[PDB]
Structure formats: structure tokens, C-alpha cells
Amino acid sequence: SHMREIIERVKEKTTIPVYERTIENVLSAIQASGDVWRIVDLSEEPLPLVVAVVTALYELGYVAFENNQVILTRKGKELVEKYGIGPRADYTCSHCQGRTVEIDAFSELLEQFKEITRDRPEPAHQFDQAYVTPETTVARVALMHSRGDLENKEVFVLGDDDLTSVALMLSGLPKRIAVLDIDERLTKFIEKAADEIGYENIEIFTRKPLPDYALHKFDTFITDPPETVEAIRAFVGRGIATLKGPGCAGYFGITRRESSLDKWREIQRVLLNEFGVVITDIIRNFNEYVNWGYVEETRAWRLLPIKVKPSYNWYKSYMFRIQTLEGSKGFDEESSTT
Amino acid sequence: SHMREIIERVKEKTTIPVYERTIENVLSAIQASGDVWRIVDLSEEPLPLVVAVVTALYELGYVAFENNQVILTRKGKELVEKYGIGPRADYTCSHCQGRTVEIDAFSELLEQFKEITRDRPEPAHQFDQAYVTPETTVARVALMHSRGDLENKEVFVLGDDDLTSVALMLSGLPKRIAVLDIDERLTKFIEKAADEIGYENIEIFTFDLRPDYALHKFDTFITDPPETVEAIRAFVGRGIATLKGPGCAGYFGITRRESSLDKWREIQRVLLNEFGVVITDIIRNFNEYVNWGYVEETRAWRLLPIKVKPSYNWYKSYMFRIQTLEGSKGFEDDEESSTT
Ligand SMILES: [Fe+3]
């Protein structure tokens, strides 16, 4: 009734699937915060969907924009009370940030990584770039090592915005590392680091039918793909094809910020049915991305009905781990952050 | 060579899939702890398979039993040195226990749940029973709440030796609760608790397997099924059948203690291909199970090379959350299990 009217207005603004739950996640988020970034964060719906919901609400008189905040009109408060939609709570563990692992034991690694990455290459708009916080990076090392995927393993880093490979060198855990990125700024920076650190067993390389040096040679890959079905499949699929065989691990990040749960379902059928891998871990908001400098240039910025820069790291991704088994094999509308 | 000889000897003892990684996980675990239960824990391989690997290792001189501990021999030290297998590290967050959620805000609920559950029915061997820690229970409530799946929601609890339906009553969050279990001791206990708490909107059912009263009527379900593909398919799929439509949630535990990753792959194909649901969260060791009193009568005890009672809660399951989408549909003991 109330809800129907909203849903059809949202459908006129986006072809991203829209459910009553979409609207409800947004309304729950709005009750807990007026900040558009944190609304996207807390609703766990993709930015362009959130915008189309908040916009529909504002057109149909349930939300107001006021003080650069998204707030419920009196009509919106009748809506949430009528549907029993409470303010979204969050009980994320304040020690691990919900990562499940503590990094107390990697404190000097953290310090070093922080120091060495002070002059890191600034994220480039045309490589869809952004890097995770050094804390995330070190949490990544602690996570991988706790699943037995680092020590004396051969590790392939497919894309390295985050400079995970520099953290891996400083940990001293891998037998060897291979890293690949399109951006020559990164690969030069990594090589300079390796050469000065004296890490010998690292190959750097600056997308199609894998070379000899990659194919079936690694124990573990990490990647953080662009957020499309095709790119997730390409990148994760190529990661899997680097793996020696059964018993090998893959790590990658998938967001709720740019991918809807309908997308997730297609991604999960690729992993399970095209690659025949098993998903061993899916950890909410494991990856915290540092806010990037080219935002005013992005579609997300043009979509926002309130132009305000984010005041915290609103953009996070879930950590996926996969493992290979017998038979495993390797190889949009919801997007806005380019 | 060493590895091949160990794998072939393990294959003579189990029909569970065996990989080099299997042997590696066990050897890595053994270097962190000699306690058999902790080895099963740390290795994240199914208990009967860890027993087979440890026996095969023993038979061939790579491990010994000393002071009730599994330890590497000199020959075993040379094997791990050769394959570069270090001791398994564990960095589980010490404050949340790796649950991702903290429960400081539910300390009232916790004491209340502990007090109400002091005299709960003892886990019956004939059913598959073990209950999670009170802390697990409340962390479940915090997780479900933080995902927007409790407050003013209709919640179906399918099986409840954990007494989640009781913690849910004390939380006051749901609009209503339905619970089903075979064990009439449990449903009696939950009725009484509903009566004393004076929670009025709970429906309790006591029977085995398959109503109007469940089908397409709930927002959220929770269940903790027996660990076979068929049981997971039936329990989780029934759970999905209680859901209204898209946008609804279910929660359930799956163990690495009693299911191999090969089994995990079949389960995940069920969830994605037969039910068409999406997996939103898979959280390692979220659920901590209270050691159960009938242990000496189980298959696990009988298989153990050393018959020592566990000194800690070694048995844990991953939390899975799923969500329904357009087109999702529901449903209309085995080789790797051993808690019997
Ligand atoms: Fe924590």
C-alpha cells in the first residue's frame, strides 16, 4: 500500500532488483543515521539502489533532505512504525573491527608497513583504484596465515593497489611471491621495495590465456576484482588457474556497495558450478578502503542527492576465501565508484 | 614419496577424500598441540579423517603417543621440515571469539538466559544433541539483530536444543516465535519458560518430520541441522519453505568437524542451485558447543587412539546466513560424522 507505491517509484529509477527488503534496509539505515554514506554502509544495498530508494521516498513524501541529512518526514515515521522497521543496530566487535582476527602479534609489521607505504602511489581514477587501510592489509596477512596459506607457500597477488605483496615481504612468511598489476607506478614501487629490503623471491609483472610462469604454480592467490560478474569471474577464474591443484586457497573481496545480492547469487553459481571451488569464509566488512581522492569525478558523486564528502571510511568489502578440491578449475548498473 | 605413502595408507582406512592438504593441515596442527581434540579443531578436517591420518602417521613412524599427546618423532620432524609445514597459528580475536559481534550490550539478556537455562534438559544421545554456550546464544541474537532479522519479525526455530527460542523471548525483539523439536523434554521446557516469562506470541510443536502454520509465514528461520547433505537439504530447505518470499533470512551451523570441504561443496550447490538462495555470511567457529555427557558412547570416542575427555569446548560450527531472492525455493549420520 504505502510500500507498493514506493516500490514502483523505485523501479522507475533503476533496473537493479528492488524488494520490500531493499526499502526496509534503507529505512532502517536512515533511522540510525542521516549521513548518506553511512546509509549506504548500513543498508548493505548498492549505492545506486540506495539513491533511487531515498529519492523515491523524498518524492513520495516519506523523507526530507534537510541540513545535508536524509531524515524521515512524519509520514516516513508512520511508515516505519506501521511496518515495525526499527533503527539498524550494529554490534561489530570493536577490537577486531569484525575481521575475526587480532593483529597484536603483527604490531611491528604494521608500523613498518605504515612507514614504507607513506609515499605509495596515489589511487588513479582510471584504474578504479583504492587501497585498504594498513590495518586491513595486516589483518589479511594474519587471516591467511591462520588458515595455513602463507608460510613457505608460493603466493600470487593479482592486482596490488593495496600493496599486499609489500606486507608479505615484510612478514617473511612466503617461499615466494608473484605480483601483477597494470599500473606501472605500483610495480615500480614494489620492485624498489623488494630490492632495498633484499627480498629475492619475488617476480613482478606488468588479463588473457595465462603464461607459463603463472599456470598451476601457486599455493594461494589474492585478488580484489572490479565489481562485475564478468570481471569477478575473469579475475577469480585466473587466480584459480594459477593454483597447483586441490588443497590451494584463494582470497578476494566482494562488496555490497556495488553489487546487489542478486549479483552475489550469480557470482556464487560461477564459483560453485563453473569453477567447482568451495567457499570456506565470507566475512562482513573485513576490508576497509581508505577514501580516494578522485571521488568528485565519479558517477557515485553525480548520483548523490546531497554532495558531501565522506567523513569516515564508508566503503568496505567482505572477505571471501575459497579452496580448491578434486575437479576444481579456473578460467554494470550497480557500479558507481569510477 | 613420504607424502604418497601416507596418503595411500590413509585411503586404506577411510572413504573420505584425502588430499596432500589434508595431511598438511593435520601435521601443522600436531606441531601446535598434541591434544587430539585440539588437533581436530586446528586442522579443520573431519574427526574420522584426522584419526585416519594420525593413525597412518603413527603406523609409519612419523608420530608417537607420549603422555597422552600426539607428537612428531624425529622422522616426523624431518617430514615437516622437508615439506615446509609450520605449526598452525591462530589469531582468533580474543574479545569476540571470532564471532565478529560483541555482546556487552546484551549482558542483561545473558545473565537472564544463563539463569533460566540452569536446569535445561540434558543432551540426549538418541537425538543429536548438544547445546551451544550461552555466549554463543546471545551472540546469535546480536548477529541476527544487527542484520535486521529479529525486531518485529516472525521467527521460526527449527530444532532447539540450543534454546534459542528462549533467548529470543527474553530479548523481546520478535513479533512472534514458532519452535519445533522432536524432543518433548525441550518443548515442555520452552512452554514453561514462555508461561513464566509470560511471552504470549510463541507457538510450540513437538514432533519428528514432514504445516499450514509454517508455510510461507515467517521472516527468518534458524536451525542447526545434523551433518549430512540430506539432512542439511531437508532442514535448511524446510526453513526456506517457512519464509514469506524474497528478502527473508535463515541462519544455520555447518561444521568442519563432521563435514569435509567436498561435502561443503555439495551443500553449497544445494543452496545455490536447488534452493536459489544467496550466502551472505560464513563465519568460522561462531558456534561453540558445550561438551556433552554421552561422549563415551559415541563413534568419535571409539575411533580415538587415545580416550581422553576433552578439556575445552573443541567442537565448533561455522555460522551461515542465507537470504532469499526472486525465484528462491525451499524443500518439499554419515561417513564423516562421529558424535553419533
Ligand atoms: Fe573481535
Side-chain angles (χ1 to χ4, degrees), chain A residues 1-337, chain B:
Chain A
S1 349
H2 262 163
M3 204 43 94
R4 170 133 310 294
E5 185 187 59
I6 295 152
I7 280 164
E8 291 175 26
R9 182 57 58 83
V10 182
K11 298 193 164 175
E12 295 179 44
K13 297 175 174 289
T14 189
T15 32
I16 304 182
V18 184
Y19 301 110
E20 171 164 348
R21 178 70 182 252
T22 312
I23 310 319
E24 170 174 6
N25 284 332
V26 170
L27 290 156
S28 187
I30 290 160
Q31 293 167 261
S33 167
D35 171 54
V36 69
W37 302 107
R38 180 63 170 171
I39 287 159
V40 176
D41 181 358
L42 290 173
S43 64
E44 296 208 76
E45 299 285 351
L47 186 139
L49 183 48
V50 170
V51 163
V53 173
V54 160
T55 289
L57 290 173
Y58 168 88
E59 289 180 13
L60 296 169
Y62 303 103
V63 297
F65 310 141
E66 150 164 330
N67 280 219
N68 314 347
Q69 300 286 288
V70 181
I71 75 165
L72 299 180
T73 67
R74 176 53 185 101
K75 190 178 169 187
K77 297 181 200 308
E78 166 167 323
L79 175 55
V80 308
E81 290 161 23
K82 204 160 245 304
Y83 285 75
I85 293 169
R88 183 57 53 93
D90 193 283
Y91 304 106
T92 300
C93 174
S94 75
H95 189 216
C96 69
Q97 280 40 65
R99 295 203 258 264
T100 78
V101 284
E102 66 192 7
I103 52 155
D104 286 59
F106 294 91
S107 59
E108 47 279 72
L109 203 222
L110 181 64
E111 149 108 10
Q112 288 171 26
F113 181 79
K114 277 192 199 282
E115 181 64 26
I116 289 175
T117 59
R118 287 169 55 78
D119 67 353
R120 58 163 299 141
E122 280 237 60
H125 185 139
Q126 93 279 17
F127 305 128
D128 181 39
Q129 276 181 354
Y131 55 86
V132 304
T133 65
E135 287 79 5
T136 294
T137 296
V138 172
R140 289 185 175 165
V141 177
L143 171 78
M144 293 189 295
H145 185 41
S146 83
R147 303 309 196 263
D149 292 324
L150 293 189
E151 187 175 2
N152 305 314
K153 302 290 182 181
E154 302 174 86
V155 183
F156 192 103
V157 181
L158 167 27
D160 204 23
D161 268 47
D162 294 329
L163 305 173
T164 307
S165 67
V166 176
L168 290 166
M169 290 190 278
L170 295 170
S171 74
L173 293 166
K175 168 162 148 164
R176 69 194 264 247
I177 299 171
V179 186
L180 162 57
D181 206 84
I182 59 216
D183 189 354
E184 210 178 11
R185 297 183 312 160
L186 291 162
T187 62
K188 297 295 175 48
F189 183 91
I190 295 160
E191 202 194 87
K192 250 83 291 127
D195 284 349
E196 293 166 7
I197 288 161
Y199 196 93
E200 286 309 316
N201 348 58
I202 187 166
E203 326 271 347
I204 296 111
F205 290 116
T206 288
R207 66 100 54 240
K208 254 345 182 148
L210 277 190
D212 176 56
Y213 78 83
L215 178 71
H216 312 334
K217 289 225 192 305
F218 291 77
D219 308 291
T220 301
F221 77 86
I222 172 149
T223 187
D224 211 9
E227 290 270 312
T228 68
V229 176
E230 21 296 312
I232 286 156
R233 181 170 177 165
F235 274 55
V236 175
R238 290 273 188 257
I240 290 162
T242 74
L243 300 180
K244 287 159 176 166
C248 288
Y251 294 84
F252 52 93
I254 299 300
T255 80
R256 297 286 290 271
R257 303 278 183 284
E258 307 201 82
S259 303
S260 67
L261 290 184
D262 283 72
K263 186 141 104 216
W264 283 50
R265 175 171 61 186
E266 298 186 57
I267 291 154
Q268 289 173 359
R269 292 163 164 179
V270 170
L271 298 180
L272 284 160
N273 304 330
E274 304 183 21
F275 309 147
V277 295
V278 69
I279 305 166
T280 68
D281 292 273
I282 295 174
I283 300 171
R284 181 182 184 232
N285 294 350
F286 187 96
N287 303 306
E288 195 193 320
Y289 298 75
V290 176
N291 287 141
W292 46 97
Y294 56 92
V295 176
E296 286 158 320
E297 309 305 313
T298 56
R299 184 154 111 102
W301 184 260
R302 177 63 178 73
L303 277 171
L304 297 177
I306 294 163
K307 306 311 184 212
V308 192
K309 266 186 177 48
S311 79
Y312 80 109
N313 288 333
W314 67 285
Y315 188 108
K316 319 197 194 75
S317 76
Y318 286 57
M319 179 59 89
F320 281 52
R321 189 177 177 280
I322 63 181
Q323 193 158 317
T324 52
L325 301 166
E326 187 174 294
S328 298
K329 71 178 183 291
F331 196 74
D332 70 13
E333 177 160 31
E334 306 177 358
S335 282
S336 61
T337 74
Chain B
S1 169
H2 301 217
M3 203 51 67
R4 190 167 161 283
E5 133 245 62
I6 294 157
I7 289 166
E8 287 189 5
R9 173 74 59 107
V10 175
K11 283 167 162 158
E12 102 185 357
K13 309 185 195 255
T14 187
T15 54
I16 302 164
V18 188
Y19 299 109
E20 179 165 345
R21 178 72 188 248
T22 307
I23 311 308
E24 179 180 334
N25 283 341
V26 170
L27 282 165
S28 184
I30 286 165
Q31 299 167 259
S33 171
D35 167 35
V36 69
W37 303 104
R38 186 63 174 151
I39 290 159
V40 175
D41 179 359
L42 275 178
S43 77
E44 299 211 77
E45 300 291 344
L47 181 153
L49 182 61
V50 175
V51 174
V53 174
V54 163
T55 296
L57 290 170
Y58 176 77
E59 287 177 0
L60 300 158
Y62 291 115
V63 307
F65 304 110
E66 289 187 19
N67 294 146
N68 272 358
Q69 308 308 294
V70 176
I71 71 169
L72 297 172
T73 60
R74 158 148 306 88
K75 177 179 195 169
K77 292 176 169 149
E78 280 131 24
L79 177 70
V80 295
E81 194 185 335
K82 179 185 308 308
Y83 284 80
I85 305 167
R88 183 53 52 93
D90 197 279
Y91 302 117
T92 295
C93 184
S94 62
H95 298 126
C96 69
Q97 319 306 107
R99 295 199 187 99
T100 75
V101 293
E102 70 192 357
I103 61 169
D104 317 40
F106 289 95
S107 61
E108 211 200 309
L109 179 63
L110 179 57
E111 285 329 277
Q112 293 170 33
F113 184 78
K114 285 161 88 153
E115 252 296 323
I116 211 165
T117 62
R118 289 284 178 271
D119 62 330
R120 94 242 291 314
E122 274 286 283
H125 192 177
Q126 63 162 139
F127 302 126
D128 189 30
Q129 302 178 336
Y131 55 89
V132 294
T133 63
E135 292 80 15
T136 299
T137 299
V138 166
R140 292 184 167 171
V141 182
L143 175 78
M144 287 172 82
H145 188 37
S146 80
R147 300 308 190 271
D149 296 320
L150 300 185
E151 184 166 14
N152 304 131
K153 295 304 171 160
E154 306 178 79
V155 183
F156 197 99
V157 187
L158 165 49
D160 206 24
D161 48 15
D162 292 333
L163 304 173
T164 307
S165 59
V166 175
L168 285 174
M169 281 190 288
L170 305 161
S171 76
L173 299 168
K175 180 169 159 203
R176 70 193 257 245
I177 300 167
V179 198
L180 185 154
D181 200 273
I182 352 79
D183 190 357
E184 190 149 32
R185 303 142 69 230
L186 288 177
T187 54
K188 209 61 154 173
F189 188 100
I190 289 157
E191 286 225 320
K192 191 113 159 31
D195 209 76
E196 300 160 289
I197 289 170
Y199 192 89
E200 223 196 44
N201 303 38
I202 183 158
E203 290 291 344
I204 299 155
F205 307 87
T206 306
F207 47 84
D208 208 326
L209 223 124
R210 288 136 99 178
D212 167 45
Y213 213 167
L215 290 188
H216 298 20
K217 280 289 167 69
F218 295 75
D219 303 297
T220 301
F221 74 87
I222 166 141
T223 185
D224 204 31
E227 255 177 52
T228 72
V229 174
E230 33 284 307
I232 291 156
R233 179 202 273 90
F235 277 52
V236 175
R238 297 263 193 238
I240 291 161
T242 75
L243 299 182
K244 290 168 185 162
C248 293
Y251 291 82
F252 55 97
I254 306 287
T255 274
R256 295 286 290 273
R257 306 288 176 280
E258 301 204 83
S259 306
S260 65
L261 286 181
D262 280 72
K263 203 200 287 169
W264 280 49
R265 185 170 52 186
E266 292 175 55
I267 283 156
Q268 292 174 358
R269 284 154 168 177
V270 174
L271 298 172
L272 281 289
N273 303 327
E274 309 189 18
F275 305 152
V277 298
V278 68
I279 311 170
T280 72
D281 296 84
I282 296 182
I283 309 164
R284 173 186 196 233
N285 295 348
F286 190 99
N287 304 303
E288 194 196 317
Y289 295 79
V290 175
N291 296 146
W292 42 95
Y294 59 90
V295 60
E296 304 196 349
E297 323 306 328
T298 61
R299 201 157 184 283
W301 190 255
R302 215 253 170 76
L303 291 175
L304 259 11
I306 309 151
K307 299 182 155 42
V308 177
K309 293 279 164 65
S311 72
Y312 81 106
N313 293 334
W314 67 284
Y315 190 95
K316 295 172 216 140
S317 77
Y318 287 53
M319 179 76 346
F320 276 60
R321 184 180 179 279
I322 54 138
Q323 195 164 308
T324 57
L325 304 159
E326 161 186 77
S328 288
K329 75 101 196 170
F331 187 63
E332 204 169 357
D333 242 323
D334 81 354
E335 57 260 311
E336 299 159 11
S337 299
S338 52
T339 69
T340 304

